[PDB]
Structures are given as C-alpha cells and as structure tokens.
Design a protein around this ligand. Structure first.
Ligand SMILES: OCCOCOCc1cc(CCCCCOc2c(Cl)cc(C3=NCCO3)cc2Cl)on1
Ligand SMILES: OCCOCOCc1cc(CCCCCOc2c(Cl)cc(C3=NCCO3)cc2Cl)on1
Lengths: 273, 40, 236, 255, 273, 59, 59, 57, 40, 40
C-alpha cells in the first residue's frame, strides 16, 4: 500500500485544495495535492484501532465489599455487608464509560472476571479460606434477604462459587432487550409528567449478588470484590463528540455546576507558539 | 478450537478490516469531485 | 491421565489476553440485529471527519469565541495566529482528533488543517499559511515563514482552504504526549496582502479552523487518556 | 447549467426552491426507507398516509440577533401539531419516520455570520442542577417552539450552555454529526435528509424523540452599517416515509 | 565439515602468512598454512553463540518494593511505597547491560517474568495472601497518585493481577519508535545548549507501576518485586568494543574517576611466562 | 473436562526455558525494519576480527 | 510432560456450565425405558394449553 | 420461519375464532385470524425452554 | 471427545428440537378443523 | 503450535545459521587473495 505517491510541480485550473466546508463534507485532501512528494508505503494496517480491539480489554467496572462475621443479632444482613449487591450497569466507573460513549448504540457479549481479596484489619490468628458465591439476580427473581436465604439455592439462576484470592470468569451473551444497548436515550418510560429521563429506565438489567459461603470464625474478615468487564464481538453505531466535562451520575449526561474551563488558555497571544 | 457450545463464549472477534469513512466524511447528496469547484 | 507441567504465569489475569469462557446463560437467544445507519469499524474512520479547533484560546472561561480567529482590515505584512503542533495538547487537545490521539501512545501521518472564511461576500483577502518542520523556531515574520511549507490562500467564492501538514520526520513515529525529540513543528498564518472590507461595512471578520487526519495516519499502542478521571464511583 | 446551488424539493403537495444551496447532507449516507419485514417485530399491518403526512411543515420563525445563543428542536416533537402528521402521532401506539430538514436564512453581500445546522441522534440533555436531577418531560417536549438556548435556566428543564451541547461535550466536536453550515457569504439554506435511526424497528412517538435539530450562530451576525441588527431564521421540515402502527384511543401526554 | 584438511611440506613463492595489517583486514589464515596437518572434522555448529541464544535467557532487570499497610494519614502513597514505580529501562542492571552493549542497535520482542515474594520483618500472626497488580503506564497516561486512584481501573492500559509468591509472565512486542533500539546515541533531543546528551532522551519508554490490591491487615507486609527480561526474535547490528570500566549511570557511557587499571600487570617481565 | 496429572517442576521459572506467552499489546504494529549495514548473527563471526593485545603489561 | 498455563476462572464452580465427569457407578446398567404417553420436550409445548384465569379476583 | 403471515380484510362464512372449549381442545388461533397482519419472522428457536436446559443447571 | 467410558458421564443432551403440543392442546378423538364449526 | 495470535508471543527464534564474518574481517575495497602479496 502506498502512503504517498510521487507527485511533481502543478500549474493547473484544477485546484483540489479550495473547497466549501459549508457542505458538511471533509474532502479527502493529501500531501501530494499541495507539495511535491516521493513514494512511501504504509507498512501498517490499523489493526489496533478496530472497535473490537478498542473495547476488547478488561476494565474495572465495580468494586464492592462484603464481610464474614457472626450474623447473630444482625437485623439487616444487607446493611451489615453480610452480603451485598450491585445494581448492574457499566457507566458507574468512568474510564470505560468515556470509551463506550464515543458511540450511541453498542452491541457485544461480555466476559467478566471477578477478583476477590481478603483483608483482616484487626488482630486475627490467621487468614481463613473463604469461598465467595455470586448469583445474578434478574429483574424479577427474589432478592435474597439474609446471607443464607432460600434464594441462594439458585436453582434456576446462574451462580459461580470461587475462593477469595482467586478469580472467577465466565461470559454472558448480549442480554439487551433491543438490537443494541442505548448509550444514550432522549426519552422516558412513558408519557408521565414526573417520570425519570435518560437510560436508567431502559438500562434496567437487575442486580448481581455476592456473599461468603463460610460461617464465621472468631475474627472478622473483609472481602473486597472487583468486577472487570471485557466486550467481545463488538458492534458500534453512530459516533458522537467525546465527553468533555466530568460525570455526576450513572445514566444522565449531567455535568457539575461551576465546573472549570476545559479548554487550556494560552500563556500568551493567539500569535504565540 | 472452540471448547464451548455457545457463541458468546468464543474469544474476541478479528479485524473488521472494513473501513469506509465516507458515511462520515462525505455524506453529501450530490457527489463532490476533488479538484472540481465545490460550488458551481 | 495425560502428564502436564504448568509454566510461570499460570493463574495470572492479564486484562488484555483473549480466551474462551463458559457462558453463564447456556442456550439463550439474543435479540435479532436490525439495520441502523452509521456503523463505525475503526477509530481511523472517524478521525478523518474534521472538527473545529478552539484556536483563539486566549479567553478565560470556555466560550464560543475561542473558535473564532479574528482578522483586521487593512493590516499588511502581519501575523494572524501561531501554534506548535503538539496534537495531544494545547489547541488540538479537545478536538476529536486530539481526543482520540490521546487514547494512543504513538502517531504518524499527515494532518489536514483548513480555514473557512466568514467575512462579507464583497470583501477580499490573501493569507499565507506556513508549516515549519521541526528544527527551526516558530517563524517570527512572513519572510521567515514563507521559506517552509506554505499555501497563498486567495479568499473567494470557494470559502475554505485545506492545508496539509505533510509528514516530515526522521523517526517514523512521534509521541502523542508532547516530547522534544519527537516534536513536529509550528503552524503560522500572515496577511499576504491584507483583508479589505466593502463600504458600509466594519469591524472584525473571523475565520473558523478545522483539523482532521489524512488517510496516511497511523496511531498505535493504546493507553489511558489524561482527559478523564474521577474521585468516587458514581451512582444512580 | 445545474449548480450545486439551485435546488427544488417537491414532497407531497409542497415544494421548496433554493437558489443558493451548498449541496445537501444525507445522514450517514442513507436515505429514508420503510421498515422491511426481515426487521419487523410487531405483527400489525402499518398505515402509510403518504402524501398527507409527507409534505413540508414550516415552523414559526426565529430571530437571529447579535446576542443569540442558538435554538434546539426535537423530532418528532416539533411536528406534534402539524396537520394529519400530528393526529396520526397521538392516535397510534407506534410510528416511524425520516425527514427532510430545510433551514433558511438570507441576508445580503454586506452581512457576515455563520450558523451550524446539525442533527444529533439520541440527544439526551443534561439537567443544569448537576448530580442526578432529571429533566422533566415538558422541558424536552417544547413542540414547535423548540428550546431557546439563550432563555434562562428553569426548574426541571435542561442546561442551555452552548459550549457544551446541552450534554457535557464541546461545541467544536458537533461536526462529527451530519451537519451543514449557513455562511451568509456562501449559503442561504441548509438541507439534511434524516433516515430513521433507532435500536428498535419502530417506537413510541411521544415518549422518545430520536433526533434534535440544532441551529447555532458560531460567527456572530454582523450587519452592514445602520442596517437593522437582526435576520429571521425559518425551519421547514417534512416527514418522509412515515408509517404508523397500533391504532387505538389517542394518547394523553403531560401538560 | 572439515575443521582441518591434510597438508604437507611447502616450498613456495606463495606465502599466505605474510600480510599487511595496515589494510584493516584480518586475513583468514589457518593451521594448515604454516604447519603440516591431518584431516579432522568440526563436529560442531556454533548453535549457542547465535545472538538469539546469547540474548535469549531471562536476566534480572529490576528489583523494587512496595508494602501493604494502613494508608490512613499517609500524605504521599508513592513515598510510603504504598505503590511504586519503575521508570522503564534495561541498562539499570549491568550483567545484561554489558551483553547488549556489544551491539549498537538491537531489535527484539520482550518476554517478562515478574516474581513477587513477601517478607514480614516484624511480628505477624500470619502471612496474608496478597494479589499484586502492575500496570504499564505509557508516556502520556495519568500517573496514579494514590494506591487506589481511578488510574488503577486501567480500562485502556494492559495490567496483570497475580499473587505474591507466584510469578506473572507476558510478552510485549518491540515497542521502539525507530527500526531498532539505540544502544548508543551521540546526539541530543534538539539543538539547545543545556539539553541532556546520550539516549536517556531517546530511551523514553514511560514507566511501570505496581501496587497490592489487598486492603491492610493488622501487621505490615513487605513485598519485593523482581522483573526478569528475555529477548526473543533478536536482531543486532554493528558490533563494538566490550565495556571495560564500571558503569555509573543509566544511559551515559561515563565511568568513575580514579578507577583502577583494568589490564592486569605482569608479575615479572615482558619475558615472563 | 480432560484428565491431567502435573509433574515435578510445575510452576518453576527456569531463566533458560523458551515458551509462548500472551502479548500484553494485542494487535500492535511494530515499526518497519529499514536496512542497516553491519548485522551480527553469531559471536563466532566477530571473534575472527583481530584486536591488539596489551602484551607489554609491565606498566 | 506437556507445558500448560492455567487461566483466570480455574477451579471455579459455575452452576450452569456443562462438562463431563467420572461415573461413580462404573458399568451399571439402567432399567430399560418402557413407553409412557405424555412426554414433554419444551416448556413452549405446554404454555399453549389454555387454563382458567381467576379474573374475578375481588374476593 | 414466519412468526406472522400477511393477512387482509375477511368477510367469510368460515369463522376460526368461534369454538367450543367444552371439547377439551385449545384451538390454534393466531393474530392473523382476527386482525390484518404483515409478515414477520421468528428469529428464535426455543432452545432455552428445552426440558434438558430447564432441569440441567 | 468423551474422556470417560460410561454414558452418564457425558455432558448435557442437545435440544430435543422435538416440539409437538398437539398431545396436550388437541387430544380430541374426532379431528377439529379451525374455521369449521366446533359442534356440527 | 502457536496458541496465541500475535507474533511477539511465540518462542525464541531458531539459529540464524547465517554467519559471514567478511563484513567485519575483510571490508577492503580491492579484494585480497591469501598467498598473493598484500601490497603490490
Ligand atoms: O452507559 C454505558 C454503556 O451503555 C450500554 O449498556 C450498558 C450495560 C452493560 C450491561 C451489562 C448487562 C448485564 C450483564 C449480564 O449479566 C450477568 C452478570 Cl453481570 C453476571 C452473571 C453471572 N452468572 C453467574 C455469576 O455471574 C450472569 C449475567 Cl447474565 O448492562 N447495561
Ligand atoms: O541500554 C540497554 C539496551 O538498549 C536498548 O533499549 C533498551 C530498552 C528496553 C526497553 C523496554 C521497553 C518497554 C517494554 C514494553 O513495555 C511494557 C512493559 Cl515493561 C510491561 C507491560 C505490562 N502489561 C501488563 C503488565 O505489564 C507492557 C508493556 Cl508494553 O526500553 N528500552
């Protein structure tokens, strides 16, 4: 492939460099339209800018935490982090979020990696070996109320059991209801006067639920869960302007008030170098 | 070799090697030729 | 039972590796795809669409006005604007090009810089745009500027002028984050003759300026952008 | 003697002529078309009023003055009250449509000024409150009036800051969306053909707008000496290939 | 292959052993040009002197250390070794350095092995099990400021998570900007009067960043990281004189003052055996 | 699931072993090679060039 | 001995995965199947039989 | 596979929607027996409702 | 590839792709045609 | 068998078995024959 062809002096009536940008086109002008060039080859394919590659590496999408401790006398397991949950979503952590929102609709399978590490902040004789269990919990299946409810039987709901310190990995097909996931949605769930705006009404995928299977030892053990997400089989439509201001909320486009100028001011003139 | 039955479980896809910027760079209704005048 | 040996790296999680995994939802059938206009395949497809450069960066809070390069009637010989070409920083940095370049470590290729004139139709002007390849200082006067890559632009019916910064380089890749060894030059613009307004007209006229990449362009070695960060996880 | 410059669009019982055009944009290089069976889901036969809905409606005019910040209309909202297009809209459960948008602004060879005319698929607005304040319905359904970016923040309304596109992105990059400029010195109209863009084959026309049309002054209007300091901008829009499905009782929407 | 051919008495006008070294050549003289030889075969190929073999074994290129401890009240994580970094480079440890600098330009893929072991120098009830994470951090991606910054999300930057006591291994293609890496560079980054000389201006590859993912236990744990590097697919040009004096700095050729004579003095005469 | 048995040596790191590894930079394209005079392939090539001997070591 | 590398997820138990296992009862012979009317293959077969709706829910 | 065929106005002596449930059958009535439909395809096989799948986790 | 000798040890079965609701939805002795009168 | 997609991930290269010391041992412009006089 040639990156530049050889081109010499020109004295024409045919001027490729004068255009009318009002038309909305970006005319494909090249170095050889306005200087004299020599042949050179590309030596490159643009492999690593493919959208599959761009969205295809694992990104941290969520960090939560649960603890193993005596539940005796706990009136609210959920509240003691005896177990916990995640209202699933991807736009919670921003690094990956800015990348996805370069597109309007996106379609992909997900591969998830879950790393779990334990901490024992206060005096323990040892490090126990805990098994985590972490059940998907669809929009419409009982949310588990205690850390050892019938829910955890998970007879119809996929669940994975792995050890703290290890990693769990599995992959879920594209579960969207439509043909693509909306990265943006300028609509409502119905025409009510006070319903929520955005995608949070679309992006309704149920939540994920972690717990330790082990009963309690004499000390307490903090287990912190990190969920990583990798898109595989990516398809993206309609590019948009990149995010400039900071994010404030999952699912709304809102930016913070009295934010700071995002364009760097010159130290000098327009004329400055 | 796929070891698994479902398609979601296969590895990453392989390069589009599609590449056609004209839907974005030249969505004009009447075709513009480089070198010919923009507005006639 | 077949005998095996495990190598160094067993059990590691590399966020960039690409392997098979069991599906959690065996046998599930995804929604059919329907057709949607606009599919993107390569980031190289989109960085060829031009977008506006806030060249007039001299303000103090972001404003629509930093997209406008002003022009003065009747000045002769003088300089319209100047900038270095660190596409990952400074004026370029918020443009779509600048914004994507920042996802990669290295770039190589030609850039297309165009200026669209917005003054009254009955006015006229001749400007010179000059690209100064690495190695010399930003030009200080047109004489200096005109000895490097340049285009005399004659403002006419055809409203925009497309200047190309041809890839001039020893090393075949430059860093997107500004680096010296790897630096690309300067871009300046001066009156060639001068802007002239018709009667009954007055004041400043402005040029809009765009930047996009030539088909020439290469970007490689993906990394994280300095353009976005956060202090606590967001919630709904 | 054909110029890129003169054009005629006849759609239904209405025709537009421009003698100073700058080509026309067809979003994503695709022209509006009906919904194919292979893409269909709802089993209902759809209704295609054709020429009674696919004609040109001219919205009320705006006034560009030196202080203007820009205006924003949403589709199909802007047309919610135009003739039979609108009736069909409130009466069917689902509908789908593409449009021809023609923005008009003429001046003289002594004026200067340049407007950006852009179509943004799925333009989800931001609350000026920050945090996770929502933007109430009424605020994103201004009707033919559209939203005036130089109007004041209101409560439950969107932010109207132009350097941020009403969503946290910079004005400068709107050029990645199908768009066309109106530069008084060149141009006097802008025309964009919009194909139907959605993640579902057909949708509700009232709970979801699928494009915002935005007209934004970028190079300020500058009139000749002792000229009146303003110009009107007119927007005329025509639904094209419209289909309605799931007819019934007639939606009642807030406010 | 014959190592020596058979050759007998000679009384010629053709003298292969008289040459003129002033010419710059090393004339290919053999035993059989000056004594009577018998046939012998080589029995050898020179396999283990191939440059791929010479540069192809893992060498320790870096030892760093980080600790897991309560960051509460630490004003400078980097400074507490709560995490740490490496300004990547190869010429930091000398064994491998002398080997590479036998050549001027070198081109290869790298395979890296990272061993992490833990130490608990002061009273602990136990040994905890820590997971290390160690992100590449390109020249132009935010340097992570705390041990748990958004940076560590590493949504676009390759990172590996492995356990202390284990090893991590992965391989990075030749990332040089030119066609080869310069082992030497007699230049500057530009013609300024005070800019740095050498390759340190060339050899600008960004740094590598390690941290423990675990929160803190009651005791403190020292984790010491050793990075090993193996060249694979080696290509080397222009041999040079081997390094004689000791090294003083990464990237400069400088040797120490009042160094010692590097040539061993005879214990005796020139005539001595 | 195929039955396996691991042998002695599993998990060891031998600095001299030669195996495959995942690339950290999937899909990256290295700079083209250009021609450079002087390529060395074997150390046996270079030890045939003669160099001076500090024979007079007595200093 | 063939060189291997284990990936993330090793040792996990996913209640939805489908693999082979050793039989605890090697060589056992199950009872023959006889014919029984009524075999169901898909839940989609049965949701097409209509059943009564307690529409008058007001009790 | 078609999920619905195209069907238009009807004015017949052949009424598929009147039945006698006392018989014990569930007559296979479709949208196209009582409204005008357009063609649409199934795009689906019913894989995940197989009893092997239902009892197999 | 089965690694094991017994049939119980193989993975899950594969979709019936049988599907015939008529034993449940139309177990009537004399065949009913849709469109013809239910009771003659 | 390569298990990985990228070339960097393959094992060590295989012996040049190139070997030609003359660029280093005899870079003279006019060819010298062993046995013939060095300087004529
Ligand atoms: O705003 C950013 C981009 O917008 C596009 O859409 C964003 C998005 C991404 C997602 C994820 C959908 C849910 C993933 C599939 O769910 C799971 C999970 Cl998260 C875990 C398991 C699981 N099984 C056993 C253990 O865990 C199974 C399923 Cl189906 O939901 N919405
Ligand atoms: O002076 C001695 C010889 O001179 C030649 O060049 C010397 C030299 C060698 C190098 C190494 C370059 C950087 C290596 C590639 O970088 C990495 C690293 Cl060091 C780690 C990871 C990584 N990914 C996940 C974890 O770590 C990824 C990449 Cl691309 O940089 N310069």
């Amino acid at each position: 492939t040639v990156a530049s062809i050889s081109s010499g002096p020109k004295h024409t009536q045919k001027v490729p460099i004068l255009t009318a940008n009002e038309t909305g086109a970006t005319m494909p002008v090249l170095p050889s339209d306005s200087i004299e060039t020599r042949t050179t080859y590309m030596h490159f394919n643009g492999s690593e800018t493919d959208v599959e590659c761009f969205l295809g590496r694992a990104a941290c999408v969520h960090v939560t935490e649960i603890q193993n401790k005596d539940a005796t006398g706990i009136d609210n397991h959920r509240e003691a982090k005896l177990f916990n949950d995640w209202k699933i979503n991807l736009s919670s952590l921003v690094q990956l979020r800015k990348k996805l929102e370069l597109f309007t609709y996106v379609r992909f399978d997900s591969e998830y990696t879950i790393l779990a590490t334990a901490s024992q902040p206060d005096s323990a004789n040892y490090s126990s070996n805990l098994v985590v269990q972490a059940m998907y919990v669809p929009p419409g299946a009982p949310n588990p109320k205690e850390w050892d409810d019938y829910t955890w039987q998970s007879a119809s709901n996929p669940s994975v059991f792995f050890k703290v310190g290890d990693t769990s990995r599995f992959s879920v097909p594209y579960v969207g209801l439509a043909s693509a996931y909306n990265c943006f949605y300028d609509g409502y769930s119905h025409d009510d006067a006070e319903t929520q705006y955005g995608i949070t009404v679309l992006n309704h995928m149920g939540s994920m639920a972690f717990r330790i299977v082990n009963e309690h030892d004499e000390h307490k053990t903090l287990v912190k869960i990190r969920v990583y997400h990798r898109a595989k089989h990516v398809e993206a439509w309609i590019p948009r302007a990149p995010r400039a201001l900071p994010y404030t909320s999952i699912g709304r486009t809102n930016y913070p008030k009295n934010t700071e100028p995002v364009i760097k001011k010159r130290k000098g003139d327009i004329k400055s170098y | 070799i796929n070891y698994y039955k479902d398609a979601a479980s296969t590895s990453s896809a392989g390069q589009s090697l599609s590449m056609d910027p004209s839907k974005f760079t030249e969505p004009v209704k009447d075709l513009m030729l480089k070198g010919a005048p923009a507005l006639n | 039972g077949l005998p095996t040996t495990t190598l160094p790296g067993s059990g590691q999680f590399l966020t960039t590796d690409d392997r098979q995994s069991p599906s959690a939802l065996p046998n599930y059938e995804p929604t059919p795809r329907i057709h949607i206009p606009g599919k993107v395949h390569n980031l190289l497809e989109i960085i060829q669409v031009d977008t506006l450069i806030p060249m007039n960066n001299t303000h103090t809070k972001d404003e629509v006005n930093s997209y406008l390069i002003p022009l003065n009637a009747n000045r002769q010989n003088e300089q319209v604007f100047g900038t270095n070409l660190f596409i990952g920083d400074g004026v370029f940095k918020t443009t779509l090009l600048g914004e994507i370049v920042q996802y990669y470590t290295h770039w190589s290729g030609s850039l297309r810089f165009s200026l669209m004139y917005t003054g009254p139709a009955l006015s006229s002007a001749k400007l010179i745009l000059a690209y100064t390849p690495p190695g010399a200082r930003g030009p200080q006067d047109r004489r200096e500027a005109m000895l490097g890559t340049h285009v005399v632009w004659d403002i006419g019916l055809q409203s925009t002028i497309v200047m190309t910064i041809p890839w001039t380089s020893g090393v075949q890749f430059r860093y997107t984050d500004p680096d010296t060894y790897t630096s690309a030059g300067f871009l300046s613009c001066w009156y060639q003759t001068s802007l002239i307004l018709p009667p009954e007209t007055t004041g400043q006229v402005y040029l809009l300026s765009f930047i996009s990449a030539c088909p020439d362009f290469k970007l490689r070695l993906m990394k994280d952008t300095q353009t976005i960060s956060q202090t606590v996880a967001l919630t709904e | 003697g054909y110029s890129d410059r003169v054009q005629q669009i006849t759609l239904g019982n209405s025709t537009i002529t421009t003698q100073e055009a700058a080509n026309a944009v067809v979003c994503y290089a695709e022209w509006p078309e009906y919904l194919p069976d292979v893409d269909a889901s709802d089993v209902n036969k759809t209704s295609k009023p054709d020429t009674s809905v696919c004609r040109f409606y001219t919205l009320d005019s705006k006034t560009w003055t030196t202080g203007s910040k820009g205006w924003c209309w949403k589709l199909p909202d802007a047309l919610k009250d135009m003739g039979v297009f609108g009736q069909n809209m409130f009466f069917h459960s689902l509908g789908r449509s593409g449009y021809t948008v023609h923005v008009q602004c003429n001046a003289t060879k002594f004026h200067s000024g340049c407007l950006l005319v852009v179509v943004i698929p799925e333009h989800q607005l931001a609350s000026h409150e920050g945090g996770n304040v929502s933007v109430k319905y009424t605020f994103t359904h201004p009707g033919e009036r559209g939203i005036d970016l130089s109007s004041a923040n209101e409560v439950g309304g969107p932010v109207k800051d132009v350097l941020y596109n009403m969503n946290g992105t910079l004005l400068g990059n709107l050029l990645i969306f199908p768009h066309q400029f109106i530069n008084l010195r060149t141009n006097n109209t802008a025309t964009i053909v919009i194909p139907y863009i959605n993640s579902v084959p057909i949708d509700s026309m009232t709970r979801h707008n699928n494009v915002s049309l935005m007209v934004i002054p970028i190079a300020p209007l500058t009139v000749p000496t002792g000229a009146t300091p303003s110009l009107p901008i007119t927007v005329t829009i025509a639904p094209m290939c419209t289909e309605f499905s799931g007819i019934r009782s007639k939606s009642i929407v807030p406010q």
